Design a protein around this ligand. Sequence first.
Ligand SMILES: [Mg+2]
Ligand SMILES: [Mg+2]
Ligand SMILES: [Mg+2]
Ligand SMILES: [Mg+2]
Ligand SMILES: [Mg+2]
Ligand SMILES: [Mg+2]
Ligand SMILES: [Mg+2]
Ligand SMILES: [Mg+2]
Ligand SMILES: [Mg+2]
Ligand SMILES: [Mg+2]
Ligand SMILES: [Mg+2]
Ligand SMILES: [Mg+2]
Ligand SMILES: [Mg+2]
Ligand SMILES: [Mg+2]
Ligand SMILES: [Mg+2]
Ligand SMILES: [Mg+2]
Ligand SMILES: [Mg+2]
Ligand SMILES: [Mg+2]
Ligand SMILES: [Mg+2]
Ligand SMILES: [Mg+2]
Ligand SMILES: [Mg+2]
Ligand SMILES: [Mg+2]
Ligand SMILES: [Mg+2]
Ligand SMILES: [Mg+2]
Ligand SMILES: [Mg+2]
Ligand SMILES: [Mg+2]
Ligand SMILES: [Mg+2]
Ligand SMILES: [Mg+2]
Ligand SMILES: [Mg+2]
Ligand SMILES: [Mg+2]
Ligand SMILES: [Mg+2]
Ligand SMILES: [Mg+2]
Ligand SMILES: [Mg+2]
Ligand SMILES: [Mg+2]
Ligand SMILES: [Mg+2]
Ligand SMILES: [Mg+2]
Ligand SMILES: [Mg+2]
Ligand SMILES: [Mg+2]
Lengths: 203, 58, 144, 63
Amino acid sequence: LSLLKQDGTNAGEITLNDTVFGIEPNEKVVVDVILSQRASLRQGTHKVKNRSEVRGGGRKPWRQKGTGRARQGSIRSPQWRGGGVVFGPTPRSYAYKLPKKVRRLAIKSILSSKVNEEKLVVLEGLTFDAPKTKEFAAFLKNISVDTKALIVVAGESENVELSARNLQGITVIPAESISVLEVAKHDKLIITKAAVEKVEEVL
Amino acid sequence: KECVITGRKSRSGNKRSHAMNSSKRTWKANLQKVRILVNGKPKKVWVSARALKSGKVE
Amino acid sequence: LHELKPSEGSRKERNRVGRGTGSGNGKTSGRGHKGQKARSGGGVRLGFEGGQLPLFRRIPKRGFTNINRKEFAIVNLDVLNRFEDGTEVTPELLVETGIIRNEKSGIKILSNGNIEKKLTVKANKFSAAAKEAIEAAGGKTEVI
Amino acid sequence: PKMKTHRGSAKRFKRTGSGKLKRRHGFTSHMFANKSQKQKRKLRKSAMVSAGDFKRIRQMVAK
RNA sequence: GGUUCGUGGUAGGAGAGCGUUCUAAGGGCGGUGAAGUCAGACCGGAAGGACUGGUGGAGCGCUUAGAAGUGAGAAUGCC
RNA sequence: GCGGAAAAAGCGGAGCCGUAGCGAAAGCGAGUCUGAAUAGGGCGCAUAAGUAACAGGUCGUAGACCCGAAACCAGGUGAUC
RNA sequence: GAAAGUUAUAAAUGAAGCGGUCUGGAAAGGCCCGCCAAAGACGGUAACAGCCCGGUAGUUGAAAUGGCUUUCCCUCCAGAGUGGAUCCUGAGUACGGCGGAACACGUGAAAUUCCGUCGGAAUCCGGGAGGACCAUCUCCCAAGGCUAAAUACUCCCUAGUGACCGAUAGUGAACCAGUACCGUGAGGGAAAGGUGAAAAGCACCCCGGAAGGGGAGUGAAACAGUUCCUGAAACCGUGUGCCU
Ligand SMILES: [Mg+2]
Ligand SMILES: [Mg+2]
Ligand SMILES: [Mg+2]
Ligand SMILES: [Mg+2]
Ligand SMILES: [Mg+2]
Ligand SMILES: [Mg+2]
Ligand SMILES: [Mg+2]
Ligand SMILES: [Mg+2]
Ligand SMILES: [Mg+2]
Ligand SMILES: [Mg+2]
Ligand SMILES: [Mg+2]
Ligand SMILES: [Mg+2]
Ligand SMILES: [Mg+2]
Ligand SMILES: [Mg+2]
Ligand SMILES: [Mg+2]
Ligand SMILES: [Mg+2]
Ligand SMILES: [Mg+2]
Ligand SMILES: [Mg+2]
Ligand SMILES: [Mg+2]
Ligand SMILES: [Mg+2]
Ligand SMILES: [Mg+2]
Ligand SMILES: [Mg+2]
Ligand SMILES: [Mg+2]
Ligand SMILES: [Mg+2]
Ligand SMILES: [Mg+2]
Ligand SMILES: [Mg+2]
Ligand SMILES: [Mg+2]
Ligand SMILES: [Mg+2]
Ligand SMILES: [Mg+2]
Ligand SMILES: [Mg+2]
Ligand SMILES: [Mg+2]
Ligand SMILES: [Mg+2]
Ligand SMILES: [Mg+2]
Ligand SMILES: [Mg+2]
Ligand SMILES: [Mg+2]
Ligand SMILES: [Mg+2]
Ligand SMILES: [Mg+2]
Ligand SMILES: [Mg+2]
């Protein structure tokens, strides 16, 4: 597919590895990995007090027989107004991983999908002399993005992270850090040639 | 109530029936009141028979 | 991300008892009426037979465990065909190839299947049939 | 926590290749005057756990 | 798409769904009036869902997935 | 566990399950055990599919669907009745 | 003991719209134009604000005290080889019997470790262990002491996070709560959040002793009137279309 520069001009074409960017996407696998990665983000810091954990409750409120009232064991029994919760949330992890091979297939398939749909833009360089958000915004217009976009870069390029930091739909990541959920969260995928090399090197 | 030389004293454990019912009991040390001088001056102190065995003041 | 469709039949809705009679699991919530099995935490322990002497106590204990029990990793002839002709096949080669991962007490060659290639196969043990079959092809079995 | 194996059972049953349980016979200590030699030969052999019993106990000896 | 035989039902098995709170992502509504609330002769096979008008005065749907403190008329239930 | 954003990968093969069973065991092995047996019979093989993860059902250990005793034990508080 | 550095405990500076117009009580909203961005965190502001305010990114800052890290001061300090005459190498100790306990191990064939009691070694030609025990071999040298890190927990402090609660929930406690109240005492132990953007919290008149009303006025609204957002149901009334 085509290879274009920051300015937006064509710079020849580049050949993506068909074992990474060519394979027939496995949608079922991508969905499974997305659900797992969403589940793994959960903090799961939720808790309620059961009848043991609620303050007080110790004594039998009134004698078992004779008073004409329903028999009760504690003022913190669950049917009592301020009483214990019966089950309800307990702190737990929601994290789980599918097997490594399925996780590799998922990233291969989501990246292949982006090529098929023509959402993947392969940039020769992408760098900035100084951190300047105006310049990065202008760059996006030259590439004709005008959506959410994941930017993937290799060379340290500290100025690229800073320049895109304040833009709302835009996420800049290393290339080592490319994940199924990050690619799925963004419409366009802008990648530098140097980053493509690093992604193919892993997959 | 403790050996001044060693530290021998009461320790707990079980009494066991045939049928192996357990109940708590103690083992007291064989402490004897005797005059010795740990400090320069003599004094009546608990000492275990075991501690007296061999070399002691009396 | 707004069009996610998990594989058809991979996920099912859990059954919720005690949520009304329309569902078919209302009121008694699938437990039927009364008795030990209708109660919270109810039910007898696993093998319990309501006081009839359980099966395991009707029948005697048998045997002992050998402290020095050896268990050999088994390699049937068929997998030796994988190797090239006139090859020396050692334990270290069998684990490098990944034919046996853990070498419990040693590697023993068994006859199941047949062998085509000429191989010099060293293992800790061979079945009588193994030795014959390796030699019948034209091999030399060594016992390390 | 892990399920615990029933140790009484682990000392009495053996799992076969097909995954069934093999057992020994009961009446095989003392009182041998009261049993016939035919009974003795039969009781000396192993037996399989019945379907009914297997359903009841299989979790006790998983692993 | 037809044909044939079926379709009372407690315990109970099986299936398909409705609705509630929250999350994600798409796409929307809302001071020209959100949610709630009140009323009605509307719609769907049911759970249920709209529309219109009053009150209300600022938030809330919808689609697809996900997760549950997810549905009450009875407990001499608790307030 | 290292690495890292309470990331994602990558690394990590120790271990686990499966690929062979039979026998109390020594052991032998597509057989093996019993047996004097080349017999018969038991369990196996001839009739390979497993494993990892998630979801449903059910079970086990946990209060384990919720409410309810009379009681038991431990440390205290009471002879202003 | 100094000195230097650094962190903490106050702070400082900090880009860009009073843009036009629509609705409105009010504009941060709609429509139409701009602009800043290492700053589009969060909150506030008369409805929803990167450009109105406090701020935020970035860049600066400490008289004083405390922590930390370096360097200096100060303080302290012998370590290799060769023989084996002799000497030393933890005693009521190890171990054993009896009685207990700890060992996953219930006295068992019961090693190992500890306690009470009684008995009681060897001591380099020595001693212990390898799950009764003996022999061989192997590995170790008890009966003296010290020792950071990797581990446990959180009354606290700082900065954050949540497919956690949202006033019968969440802490018992959003509110002067371990209060009120109950109990001789130990102890038990509540209920109870919302005027409005702003008090502009209703001058004045009228009935009434007052309370409370009705006007008038404020306000977007007072059927928002000092407990005052919404205001369901039970329950209590007035009126009346049809029936009795
Ligand atoms: Mg309690
Ligand atoms: Mg009554
Ligand atoms: Mg109770
Ligand atoms: Mg309360
Ligand atoms: Mg509560
Ligand atoms: Mg269902
Ligand atoms: Mg039924
Ligand atoms: Mg009912
Ligand atoms: Mg019933
Ligand atoms: Mg009955
Ligand atoms: Mg029953
Ligand atoms: Mg009986
Ligand atoms: Mg016998
Ligand atoms: Mg029917
Ligand atoms: Mg019919
Ligand atoms: Mg069912
Ligand atoms: Mg809501
Ligand atoms: Mg309401
Ligand atoms: Mg509920
Ligand atoms: Mg009621
Ligand atoms: Mg008693
Ligand atoms: Mg007293
Ligand atoms: Mg008196
Ligand atoms: Mg400013
Ligand atoms: Mg106007
Ligand atoms: Mg408002
Ligand atoms: Mg506001
Ligand atoms: Mg003893
Ligand atoms: Mg024990
Ligand atoms: Mg010994
Ligand atoms: Mg002793
Ligand atoms: Mg010893
Ligand atoms: Mg031994
Ligand atoms: Mg042992
Ligand atoms: Mg020594
Ligand atoms: Mg409360
Ligand atoms: Mg409320
Ligand atoms: Mg009031």
